[PDB]
Amino acid sequence: IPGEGHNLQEHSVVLIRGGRVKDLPGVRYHIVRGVYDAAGVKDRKKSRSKYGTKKPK
Amino acid sequence: RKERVARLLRMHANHREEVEELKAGDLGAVVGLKETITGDTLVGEDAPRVILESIEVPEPVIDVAIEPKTKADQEKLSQALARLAEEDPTFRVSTHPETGQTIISGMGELHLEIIVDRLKREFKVDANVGKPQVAYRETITKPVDVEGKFIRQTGGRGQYGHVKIKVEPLPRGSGFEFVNAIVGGVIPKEYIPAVQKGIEEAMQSGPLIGFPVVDIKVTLYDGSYHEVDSSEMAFKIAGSMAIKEAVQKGDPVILEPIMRVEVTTPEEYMGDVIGD
Amino acid sequence: MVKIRLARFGSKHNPHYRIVVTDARRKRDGKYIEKIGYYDPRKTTPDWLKVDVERARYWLSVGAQPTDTARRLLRQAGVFRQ
Amino acid sequence: RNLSALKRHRQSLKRRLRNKAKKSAIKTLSKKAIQLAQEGKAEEALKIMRKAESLIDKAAKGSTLHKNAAARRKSRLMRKVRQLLEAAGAPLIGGG
Amino acid sequence: GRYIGPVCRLCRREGVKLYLKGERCYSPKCAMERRPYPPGQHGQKRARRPSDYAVRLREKQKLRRIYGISERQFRNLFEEASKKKGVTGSVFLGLLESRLDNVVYRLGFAVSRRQARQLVRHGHITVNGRRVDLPSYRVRPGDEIAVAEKSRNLELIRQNLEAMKGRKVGPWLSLDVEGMKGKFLRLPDREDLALPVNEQLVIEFYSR
RNA sequence: UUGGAGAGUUUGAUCCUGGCUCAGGGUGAACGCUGGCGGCGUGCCUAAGACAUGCAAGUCGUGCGGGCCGCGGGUCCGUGGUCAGCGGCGGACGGGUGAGUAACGCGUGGGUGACCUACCCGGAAGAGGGGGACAACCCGGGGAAACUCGGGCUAAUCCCCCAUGUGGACCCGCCCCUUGGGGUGUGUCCAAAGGGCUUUGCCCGCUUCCGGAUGGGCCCGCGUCCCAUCAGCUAGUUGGUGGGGUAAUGGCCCACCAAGGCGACGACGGGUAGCCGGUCUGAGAGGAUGGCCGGCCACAGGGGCACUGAGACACGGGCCCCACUCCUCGGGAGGCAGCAGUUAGGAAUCUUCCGCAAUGGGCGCAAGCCUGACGGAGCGACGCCGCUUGGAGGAAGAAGCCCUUCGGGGUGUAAACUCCUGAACCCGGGACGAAACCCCCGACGAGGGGACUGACGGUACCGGGGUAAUAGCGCCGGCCAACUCCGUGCCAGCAGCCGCGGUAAUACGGAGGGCGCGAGCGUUACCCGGAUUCACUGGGCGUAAAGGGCGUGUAGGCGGCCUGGGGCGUCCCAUGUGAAAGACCACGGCUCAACCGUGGGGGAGCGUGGGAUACGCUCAGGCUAGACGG
RNA sequence: CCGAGGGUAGGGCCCGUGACUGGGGCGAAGUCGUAACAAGGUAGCUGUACCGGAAGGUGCGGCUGGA
Ligand code: SF4
Ligand SMILES: [Mg+2]
Ligand SMILES: [Mg+2]
Ligand SMILES: [Mg+2]
Ligand SMILES: [Mg+2]
Ligand SMILES: [Mg+2]
Ligand SMILES: [Mg+2]
Ligand SMILES: [Mg+2]
Ligand SMILES: [Mg+2]
Ligand SMILES: [Mg+2]
Ligand SMILES: [Mg+2]
Ligand SMILES: [Mg+2]
Ligand SMILES: [Mg+2]
Ligand SMILES: [Mg+2]
Ligand SMILES: [Mg+2]
Ligand SMILES: [Mg+2]
Ligand SMILES: [Mg+2]
Ligand SMILES: [Mg+2]
Ligand SMILES: [Mg+2]
Ligand SMILES: [Mg+2]
Ligand SMILES: [Mg+2]
Ligand SMILES: [Mg+2]
Ligand SMILES: [Mg+2]
Ligand SMILES: [Mg+2]
Ligand SMILES: [Mg+2]
Ligand SMILES: [Mg+2]
Ligand SMILES: [Mg+2]
Ligand SMILES: [Mg+2]
Ligand SMILES: [Mg+2]
Ligand SMILES: [Mg+2]
Ligand SMILES: [Mg+2]
Ligand SMILES: [Mg+2]
Ligand SMILES: [Mg+2]
Ligand SMILES: [Mg+2]
Ligand SMILES: [Mg+2]
Ligand SMILES: [Mg+2]
Ligand SMILES: [Mg+2]
Ligand SMILES: [Mg+2]
Ligand SMILES: [Mg+2]
Ligand SMILES: [Mg+2]
Ligand SMILES: [Mg+2]
Ligand SMILES: [Mg+2]
Ligand SMILES: [Mg+2]
Ligand SMILES: [Mg+2]
Ligand SMILES: [Mg+2]
Ligand SMILES: [Mg+2]
Ligand SMILES: [Mg+2]
Ligand SMILES: [Mg+2]
Ligand SMILES: [Mg+2]
Ligand SMILES: [Mg+2]
Ligand SMILES: [Mg+2]
Ligand SMILES: [Mg+2]
Ligand SMILES: [Mg+2]
Ligand SMILES: [Mg+2]
Ligand SMILES: [Mg+2]
Ligand SMILES: [Mg+2]
Ligand SMILES: [Mg+2]
Ligand SMILES: [Mg+2]
Ligand SMILES: [Mg+2]
Ligand SMILES: [Mg+2]
Ligand SMILES: [Mg+2]
Ligand SMILES: [Mg+2]
Ligand SMILES: [Mg+2]
Numbered sequence A: 001i002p003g004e005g006h007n008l009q010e011h012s013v014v015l016i017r018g019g020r021v022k023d024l025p026g027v028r029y030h031i032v033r034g035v036y037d038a039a040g041v042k043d044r045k046k047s048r049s050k051y052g053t054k055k056p057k
Numbered sequence B: 001r002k003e004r005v006a007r008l009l010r011m012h013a014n015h016r017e018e019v020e021e022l023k024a025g026d027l028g029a030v031v032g033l034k035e036t037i038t039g040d041t042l043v044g045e046d047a048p049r050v051i052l053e054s055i056e057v058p059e060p061v062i063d064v065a066i067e068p069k070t071k072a073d074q075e076k077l078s079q080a081l082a083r084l085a086e087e088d089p090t091f092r093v094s095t096h097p098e099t100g101q102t103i104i105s106g107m108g109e110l111h112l113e114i115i116v117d118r119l120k121r122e123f124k125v126d127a128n129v130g131k132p133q134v135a136y137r138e139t140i141t142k143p144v145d146v147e148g149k150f151i152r153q154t155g156g157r158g159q160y161g162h163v164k165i166k167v168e169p170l171p172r173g174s175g176f177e178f179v180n181a182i183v184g185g186v187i188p189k190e191y192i193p194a195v196q197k198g199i200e201e202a203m204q205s206g207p208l209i210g211f212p213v214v215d216i217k218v219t220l221y222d223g224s225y226h227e228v229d230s231s232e233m234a235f236k237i238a239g240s241m242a243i244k245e246a247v248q249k250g251d252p253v254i255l256e257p258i259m260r261v262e263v264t265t266p267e268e269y270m271g272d273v274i275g276d
Numbered sequence C: 001m002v003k004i005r006l007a008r009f010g011s012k013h014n015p016h017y018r019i020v021v022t023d024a025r026r027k028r029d030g031k032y033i034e035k036i037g038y039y040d041p042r043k044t045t046p047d048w049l050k051v052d053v054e055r056a057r058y059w060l061s062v063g064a065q066p067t068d069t070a071r072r073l074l075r076q077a078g079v080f081r082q
Numbered sequence D: 001r002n003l004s005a006l007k008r009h010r011q012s013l014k015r016r017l018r019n020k021a022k023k024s025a026i027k028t029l030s031k032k033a034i035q036l037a038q039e040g041k042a043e044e045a046l047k048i049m050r051k052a053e054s055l056i057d058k059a060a061k062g063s064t065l066h067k068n069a070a071a072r073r074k075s076r077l078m079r080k081v082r083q084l085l086e087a088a089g090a091p092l093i094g095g096g
Numbered sequence E: 001g002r003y004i005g006p007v008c009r010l011c012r013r014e015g016v017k018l019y020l021k022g023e024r025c026y027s028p029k030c031a032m033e034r035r036p037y038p039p040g041q042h043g044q045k046r047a048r049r050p051s052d053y054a055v056r057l058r059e060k061q062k063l064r065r066i067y068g069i070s071e072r073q074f075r076n077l078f079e080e081a082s083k084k085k086g087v088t089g090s091v092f093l094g095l096l097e098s099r100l101d102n103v104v105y106r107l108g109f110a111v112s113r114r115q116a117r118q119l120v121r122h123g124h125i126t127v128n129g130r131r132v133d134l135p136s137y138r139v140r141p142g143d144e145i146a147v148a149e150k151s152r153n154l155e156l157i158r159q160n161l162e163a164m165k166g167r168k169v170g171p172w173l174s175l176d177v178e179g180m181k182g183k184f185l186r187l188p189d190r191e192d193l194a195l196p197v198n199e200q201l202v203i204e205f206y207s208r
Numbered sequence F: 001u002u003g004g005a006g007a008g009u010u011u012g013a014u015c016c017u018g019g020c021u022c023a024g025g026g027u028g029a030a031c032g033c034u035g036g037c038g039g040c041g042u043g044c045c046u047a048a049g050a051c052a053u054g055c056a057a058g059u060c061g062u063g064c065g066g067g068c069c070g071c072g073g074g075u076c077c078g079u080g081g082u083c084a085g086c087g088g089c090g091g092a093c094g095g096g097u098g099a100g101u102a103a104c105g106c107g108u109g110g111g112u113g114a115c116c117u118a119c120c121c122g123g124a125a126g127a128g129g130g131g132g133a134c135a136a137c138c139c140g141g142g143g144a145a146a147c148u149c150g151g152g153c154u155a156a157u158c159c160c161c162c163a164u165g166u167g168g169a170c171c172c173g174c175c176c177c178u179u180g181g182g183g184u185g186u187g188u189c190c191a192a193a194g195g196g197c198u199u200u201g202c203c204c205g206c207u208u209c210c211g212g213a214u215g216g217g218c219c220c221g222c223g224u225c226c227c228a229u230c231a232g233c234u235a236g237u238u239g240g241u242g243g244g245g246u247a248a249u250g251g252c253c254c255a256c257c258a259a260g261g262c263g264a265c266g267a268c269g270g271g272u273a274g275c276c277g278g279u280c281u282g283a284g285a286g287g288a289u290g291g292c293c294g295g296c297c298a299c300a301g302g303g304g305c306a307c308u309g310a311g312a313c314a315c316g317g318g319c320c321c322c323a324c325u326c327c328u329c330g331g332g333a334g335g336c337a338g339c340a341g342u343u344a345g346g347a348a349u350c351u352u353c354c355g356c357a358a359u360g361g362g363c364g365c366a367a368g369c370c371u372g373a374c375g376g377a378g379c380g381a382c383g384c385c386g387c388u389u390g391g392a393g394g395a396a397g398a399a400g401c402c403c404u405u406c407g408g409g410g411u412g413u414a415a416a417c418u419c420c421u422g423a424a425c426c427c428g429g430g431a432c433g434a435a436a437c438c439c440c441c442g443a444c445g446a447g448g449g450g451a452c453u454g455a456c457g458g459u460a461c462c463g464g465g466g467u468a469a470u471a472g473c474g475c476c477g478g479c480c481a482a483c484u485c486c487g488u489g490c491c492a493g494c495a496g497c498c499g500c501g502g503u504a505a506u507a508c509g510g511a512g513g514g515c516g517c518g519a520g521c522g523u524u525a526c527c528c529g530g531a532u533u534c535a536c537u538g539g540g541c542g543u544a545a546a547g548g549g550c551g552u553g554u555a556g557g558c559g560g561c562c563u564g565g566g567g568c569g570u571c572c573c574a575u576g577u578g579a580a581a582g583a584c585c586a587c588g589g590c591u592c593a594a595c596c597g598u599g600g601g602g603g604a605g606c607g608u609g610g611g612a613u614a615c616g617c618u619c620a621g622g623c624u625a626g627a628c629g630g
Numbered sequence G: 001c002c003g004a005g006g007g008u009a010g011g012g013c014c015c016g017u018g019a020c021u022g023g024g025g026c027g028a029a030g031u032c033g034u035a036a037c038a039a040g041g042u043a044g045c046u047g048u049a050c051c052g053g054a055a056g057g058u059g060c061g062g063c064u065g066g067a
């Protein structure tokens, strides 16, 4: 789960994409933030596209 | 997302009727939407993308204030909660306008017993709490009719705002109603936005225990102006005085929060429970 | 029976047929026997019609059937002129 | 819930009928002529093989038999009656 | 569409006046003659040795930025020149040059290419008698490039024709003023045109 | 000779080996953030899962007889509608899908002396005589329906017999040919149908036969994926005689006789896959791929089967079994992998639209009828191409914000501001695609003359008036273009590889600034590339991975010197084939471009003919330097 | 007669799952010893054999990539 803070828990519906995390052996996928019950990151500004976060005002 | 209103139906007692249109204020069954669920708002393709208040209301019920203690790490508490205002959006972090503190609203005694606990044993947070849950509200018992004057023409520098409103009691739960009954233009069209900024703001603190005044209707019907003196900051504070005075007038009191409580006990202690 | 036909090519709102000899049973834009001319019905060029008039006379001669508006193009370029 | 496809079926049945019948008689006589050649019985075999000859080609007029099949059917009937009669001749009347 | 931004910064990055602004380019109010260093917080900081890549990258953005042309359309033109016969460098510039919004520039109907773009877009030009509003139109050798007379009575065309009385236009071009037309005689040779670009470098940028 | 870039990462450092990773191009894509206009393309990749509703194949009154509604009057008859029926042609095309298939299935080139081909076109001959049946219709049972049962009338281009025999068919003999090819004689057998109009004459039909054209069937050479941890397979099995079947060859099927047939040149088996034109990548060689479009194949809920027929073992025909679902007690009903659409599954994939105006198709003398082929329109940045968000001027340079050594630097001519142009919108006009069929003249021909019809569409485009009028996304340790402040303190997080973060982080989070693209920008997934990292081009094995523990030898591979025969390889010329589209080059049409048309250039590969003989092959003859022997 | 398929019976291959058990990989700071790398404190490696908590030791023969 990428980003600072999430909202996922048991029974969270979720969408995964490829890509391993080098540090966590056995992890080989990432949760696409901003889809299904995965939220975007609150207060994110740079690279918002990669984190499910919509454009602020 | 876009969707394709294909056909359009009306259910009768003994058959379905296909119609060619559905005028506003009427209702029926549209066939063809795929990804639309309940509470979603549908508008025309070429049309202002509004979201009707569909799906609504929480509400938080326990008010615990957390004083940021000391003092150059207040920003980590205001950032811990920005991690918590997204993991758990049931609660509210709001600064008291006057007295000026950050108050952690919530959903019960236990809900703040976990947030203020996880806050400390994971983030350290230099801060401590009391605190009650003194989270009442305020409303009136009878319809009141007052004025809202705000005049300072003792030097020329602005300050004229006249307002007269009918504040009636609303059925409990309906929130806040606001109608604009100005006949003609005895108050200008541009001063109407920010005279609600004085009413809606003067309801956030109350007349007896200083808690949000909810469940009333406000009909603004009268008021005069000065062409030179009338500033938008002189029509805001005329509505604030009037409401703080109107709410104060016709019988206001304390609406406390009630709980639906399901206690799951062994039957041996049921009476110990019930009576108590 | 074997036919002389317009086989549509080109694009949308850009007809450019390909007056052609083919078995009646084909797809319009399908494998033909021989090509024996073209046609740009919108006359967008000096030559909006050519025909190997030699061959149309051959094919005709062995039973080939012109379409109702394929003789039109065969006639206009005089395959029938004595 | 429609058609003249059903007309085609109603039609194809009478055809089939009329076809099957000719075909029967053909085989029956063809067989019958060959039998009468096997014991020959010379005059009679040819007399019969003629009615067969006749019924074979008459069948080939319609959609019953292909012209080549009636030709096929005919060849074999002849080479059978003839090679049969071979064991003891007297082949009059005519069909040789 | 086009770059459509602040342009003085473009030039300061390039370290070379590209003439993109029109009259002020020659004025001393030009930014390059006030600040000959790149834009933003770090410009007056002592540069560090550019990479071979950096060099080709910059040399290409140069040629690109001059013609105000999408990297897409650019690349497209470049590829066509490689497929085309003989020299790529020449044909690229050539093909770059044959652009209608660019023909209209060296015929000085407008001051800046941006200005010429709008001129082409708004109907004000004409190729060979018919109206043509497509800034990409590949001007072929032998064509007639006029202001359309339905807008010859116009303050801005006048003022720029006015300033184009007796200036020699490049060898491949012919400008009859008053009549306000022009002719694309031939496509430019390499030596025939100077621009602050080493052509060979752009080629090497796409060969990476 | 139009074609070929590499980088980071093993060490303290080096050189080498070697894997890993990145930059590029691509996609029927999808997901995040974002999103103004138009054009051409394109859009269920998954459940060949299940489907509500509408439509997707009919047409001929110039084949025949009929019942009901009219229109002139003397219950009559004519007539034209109309509904079915009989009859004819169509329904085997067109449209969908990729399940099955590793096969003569496809590709390429050939064979058919072993064959069919409705309609269309040429050439020859004929249409004489007689009879007959069944529907419709009138009569009668059952059903809640499908609907059906039985008795009687009747017409024809429906069915049958007789005759004619141009001709064709079969048996037997002979002549030429050589697999069943053409010819001949005697025997036997076989044709047919009328309708119409303006009626001593044409028109559409019918009959047998011959040829053509087109479309096919069957056969054969060569090519077509993974596993040998699948090594042996085969009883209709291989061949033969006879016979059945078919348009036709054949173990295709049957009976008998024989004991065969196939396999390391990979049989059998298992896995996966429709194949091709082409598409993508690549310097090429190569790799990967088969969506759209064109060609063939296969399949029409899962199966079997045959009928009709020129043609089917038939997507919207029949029969039977199975599964499933459906309508209200015997039974019946259904078949969207047609077009739209629903439902399910899925990361995902469109309107229950418009029109037969055109092109093509079916029937028709023709008017015409039908055509979810097709022509259009709709939705989706899916893709590609075009276009807009303004242009010129505007300070040693406002405000705000960022940095600072507190002087200043930066955003930045950017803004404001002036002027100019004028996307949108508004009015006016307004298409090409449409000239045939038909009518008139001629002769129902050649030729001339005339008329009718446009879904898209009041759209494109043209004229006039006309408003400054969306910007976003990734990224800024190195590879790799773009740097500083603050926050944070092995936390929170980043991460494609090397790696960042433990209190002064150009690598995290915000900011200001910068770089790159721009109605898009990024991510994930897959393909080719870089990868000379399966190396034919173009690699290796003492110590890096890699010489079998060593012999002997089977198959196979390779093979000395001279002369001749053949010409198998090899080379050369010609000729046929190598469809169209695509790709390429040139020209042109849409204002450009995408897209689209015309013309060119052709090659590999096979067929045939002709030629050469160095090398390779084979055959013959000779040698003695290899090899073997005394 | 053949024939979809239904049934009976017996085999072959594949896939998933199984008390328990085998060893394998990985995992910032566990326990025991110290086998290897310096003659690594008994040169090392080796095929095999038997033994031993563990690394390993010992026999026989081999190698130098050791003296
Ligand atoms: S003024 Fe003209 S030339 Fe000087 S920098 Fe700005 S644009 Fe470039
Ligand atoms: Mg949940
Ligand atoms: Mg959910
Ligand atoms: Mg980042
Ligand atoms: Mg019998
Ligand atoms: Mg038949
Ligand atoms: Mg027949
Ligand atoms: Mg104007
Ligand atoms: Mg390249
Ligand atoms: Mg390297
Ligand atoms: Mg390293
Ligand atoms: Mg090492
Ligand atoms: Mg190091
Ligand atoms: Mg390397
Ligand atoms: Mg599918
Ligand atoms: Mg695909
Ligand atoms: Mg249905
Ligand atoms: Mg009828
Ligand atoms: Mg038929
Ligand atoms: Mg398939
Ligand atoms: Mg197989
Ligand atoms: Mg084969
Ligand atoms: Mg073949
Ligand atoms: Mg009769
Ligand atoms: Mg007769
Ligand atoms: Mg047998
Ligand atoms: Mg046989
Ligand atoms: Mg035989
Ligand atoms: Mg067999
Ligand atoms: Mg035997
Ligand atoms: Mg399989
Ligand atoms: Mg398959
Ligand atoms: Mg290479
Ligand atoms: Mg296809
Ligand atoms: Mg099947
Ligand atoms: Mg079936
Ligand atoms: Mg199905
Ligand atoms: Mg079936
Ligand atoms: Mg037929
Ligand atoms: Mg079939
Ligand atoms: Mg059918
Ligand atoms: Mg069937
Ligand atoms: Mg169907
Ligand atoms: Mg469908
Ligand atoms: Mg779903
Ligand atoms: Mg579509
Ligand atoms: Mg759909
Ligand atoms: Mg039509
Ligand atoms: Mg038509
Ligand atoms: Mg329709
Ligand atoms: Mg359009
Ligand atoms: Mg678009
Ligand atoms: Mg999107
Ligand atoms: Mg200054
Ligand atoms: Mg400033
Ligand atoms: Mg300053
Ligand atoms: Mg400007
Ligand atoms: Mg027209
Ligand atoms: Mg006449
Ligand atoms: Mg209009
Ligand atoms: Mg205009
Ligand atoms: Mg104006
Ligand atoms: Mg502006």
Ligand SMILES: [Mg+2]
Pocket (backbone or CB within 6 Å): F474, F475
């Ligand atoms: Mg980037």
Ligand SMILES: [Mg+2]
Pocket (backbone or CB within 6 Å): F480
């Ligand atoms: Mg890059």
Ligand SMILES: [Mg+2]
Pocket (backbone or CB within 6 Å): none
């Ligand atoms: Mg750099």
Ligand SMILES: [Mg+2]
Pocket (backbone or CB within 6 Å): none
């Ligand atoms: Mg500081």
Ligand SMILES: [Mg+2]
Pocket (backbone or CB within 6 Å): F491, F492
């Ligand atoms: Mg922290």
Ligand SMILES: [Mg+2]
Pocket (backbone or CB within 6 Å): none
């Ligand atoms: Mg540090």
Ligand SMILES: [Mg+2]
Pocket (backbone or CB within 6 Å): F504, F505
């Ligand atoms: Mg810091």
Ligand SMILES: [Mg+2]
Pocket (backbone or CB within 6 Å): none
């Ligand atoms: Mg940073």
Ligand SMILES: [Mg+2]
Pocket (backbone or CB within 6 Å): F507
């Ligand atoms: Mg980074």
Ligand SMILES: [Mg+2]
Pocket (backbone or CB within 6 Å): none
């Ligand atoms: Mg674009």
Ligand SMILES: [Mg+2]
Pocket (backbone or CB within 6 Å): none
């Ligand atoms: Mg690769």
Ligand SMILES: [Mg+2]
Pocket (backbone or CB within 6 Å): E208, F006, F530
């Ligand atoms: Mg490279």
Ligand SMILES: [Mg+2]
Pocket (backbone or CB within 6 Å): none
């Ligand atoms: Mg390359």
Ligand SMILES: [Mg+2]
Pocket (backbone or CB within 6 Å): none
């Ligand atoms: Mg390779």
Ligand SMILES: [Mg+2]
Pocket (backbone or CB within 6 Å): F533
């Ligand atoms: Mg490898």
Ligand SMILES: [Mg+2]
Pocket (backbone or CB within 6 Å): F535
């Ligand atoms: Mg090699």
